[model samples]
Target: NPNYCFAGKTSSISDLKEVPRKNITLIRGLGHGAFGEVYEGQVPLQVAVKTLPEVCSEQDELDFLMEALIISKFNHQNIVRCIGVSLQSLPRFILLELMAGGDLKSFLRETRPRPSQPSSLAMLDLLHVARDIACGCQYLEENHFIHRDIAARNCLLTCPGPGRVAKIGDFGMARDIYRGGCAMLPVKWMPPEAFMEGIFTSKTDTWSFGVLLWEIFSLGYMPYPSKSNQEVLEFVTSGGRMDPPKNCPGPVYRIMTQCWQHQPEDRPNFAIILERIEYCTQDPDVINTALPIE
Candidate 1:
């Protein structure tokens, strides 16, 4: 039964179960994270159900609930679809479109020939993924939301008809523009400013995207493999940034450079990055357009 807190107000738990489970089926738990646990259930019609953890502080719980609610409003091919939220009781659940292939991190791990497929991801494939990511980022920016966490682990590859497509997921760190400008982000993938406890901006997101691009090209190789957490911090503080792997093409390198620029204002926005990728994918002659004609 749906649990009501005040008059007709329903709690998250009951609300989740109350939703008409269409073609999706409620399977078993797939994984668990800090804020919640994921399940492999189907919507009977074909969707995934992600249930939030029951134990959490009031503020943290409210943030999780708000993330799902806000993400549900965004509908782009590159962004995961939120079917609905279960808000009938405490510990809410979110219903999302299922991505059969899983997240980019796991997919790359499984597909790598040896330990990693760093050399196999050519310029074309890497650019393709970058373009999709940029598209999703553009959508978020347009909608006045900042995806503070934009890493490979949070991105999923969906089987889009003839070709595979990328979808952004795990918006637990997402924040609205009006809400204090920026938030503290993950240390590993964050920009120098973010690590310094500075406010988060779209540029910080671009920095994380650059790291994600590296992950795609390297087939899931951990960023800064040579450095420890302390060393990474030191490197960033010293104005050092990750260098693209040898296999990553020139265009990708340029893109990453633009993304990892020391100054946030110097970084290219997602729309421009998307255009560059689209040109490369659709027009073979434009491969090295970023380079001089001479």
Candidate 2:
């Protein structure tokens, strides 16, 4: 019960249950990564399983083990749920809840409507998705962890739950203990400071969120379309941002602009962003579905 150890941490992550290998059966490959392949596991409960390499150095193995523990601690609805760990094979593996919608990138690619017609889904739903991400980010910030990467592609859209909606996945970085590397990251979602000096913090995450908002509004259009990563980096640092995406509500667009503030301190934190969403959506029939976080 709550059997993980990390200093300065008050929350007890008693939620993470340890499940043995016999309880799980690998189904098929869902995706591939540096370590190996991720599978859709038939734990009878439909879970995701990621394979670990057998011959990695001690450091890599320890890091892989540590990654599961940290991810297991996240209790937010907008964050992916790590169900348990399996250490039966030569390498190892971790189990996660299956997100059937795949990911936001693919989902939006199929669902976002043409500019001439309205999307079958209501605008409020999209707005709510953005809000859920902010809720999760706020939780991570207050916990003293910096998500160096924040983008729509990293977010997973579920089939809709009891009020809760989108769930963000992982962050990749040079300092990333979990997500691997810059090769896996989107430059358009990265802030100038991140490109300029590899510096990262909550503020950098805010900058990335601004671009993520653009992706959401554009219906999954790649940010800085047709531009190379280095070129996009140069232009953004030199005081440039893509104009507000078409059909993006002005209120939401304004929030994106604030997230692009030149100075990190100038940008608002997730708490303030969350407040903005709550106030903006007050008129809707749906009050904040995001209940007070722990």
Candidate 3:
């Protein structure tokens, strides 16, 4: 099934391609990622193509295409669309929808407000970004898929505008725990179950979502700021959590705390999290109002 990594079939990767090699032309460099370099491509339409560098082993090629397989099955506005892949031969490629505004991390940091000068971005805008991510996560949960890494950095923005779009992308870290293997984890974004027990599930994703929300409301500030990975590991395990971001609404902060619940069972599902965000969006006056920083 497409819900399973690699569609649960080694041969299915070839079936997922929509754009052939001849159609795609690499133009300029966008950025480098875990798998390969992402470049702006001319597929007759604006698209971002992730090119597969030379691989040493057969297994390496499959690992590079795994993200394409994972995202191909999902159909959500909040989830980045996989236009297609170019894998007829070597130097394979995964074509994705171009996010003009770039990754949400840089986008959020670019406009982060300072105490000396308040931001021009509306509070509602940040909340909308969070809401979009929740919508995508909800879809993944319903489909029985886990994102493994859910963070602002993995999310992308379509543009900076009155109504910009946020989409969850970068699934290179996604792996099947049932498949069984050791993998490096995103330390700051992980829950105790992930770091301690080496477990991953939809609920673990919920914990990461909480951290992503903190990043959003904090205007893309890195989580556990000024703390090392080991420090965050100890800090989180000891029942410590981050304080509310400056001017973050009380209700929104409540959602972040709820996501950070130490027990996975105590955490709210993406469905409930999305519902709360929906309520927050409905009341702009209260949600948009900034609380006093103390």
Give the deviation of candidate 2 from the true structure as CA RMSD: 6.0
Which lDDT values do the candidates have, in the order given? Answer: 0.68, 0.71, 0.81
TM values, all candidates: 0.79, 0.82, 0.89
Tell me how far the alpha carbon of residue 88 in candidate 3 is from the true structure, in angstroms, after superposition. Answer: 2.0
Task: Assess candidate 2 and give its lDDT.
Answer: 0.71
Instruction: Give one digit per residue, the lDDT tens place, for model 1 in 31-50.
Output: 77655778877654566777
What TM-score, to 2 decimals, does candidate 3 have? 0.89
Using alpha carbons, what is the TM-score of model 1? 0.79
The alpha-carbon RMSD values of the candidates against the true structure, listed in the order shown, are 6.9, 6.0, 3.3
Put the candidates in lDDT order, highest first. 3, 2, 1
Better model by TM-score: candidate 1 vs candidate 2: 2
Error of 3 at 25 (Å): 1.8
For model 3, how does the per-residue alpha-carbon lDDT over 148-267 read when each residue is reduced to its tens digit? 889998999988765789999877677433222333558899999889888888998899999999998888789988998889999999999999987788888899999999999999
Q: Once superposed on the true structure, which residue ranges of model 1 sit more than 4 Å away at CA?
A: 1-24, 89-91, 113-123, 160-162, 175-185, 282-294
For the record, the alpha-carbon RMSD of candidate 3 to the native fold, in angstroms, is 3.3
Please give the distance, in angstroms, between residue 121's alpha carbon in candidate 1 and its true position after superposition: 5.8
Rank candidates by TM-score, best first. Answer: 3, 2, 1
Residue 67 local lDDT, model 2: 63
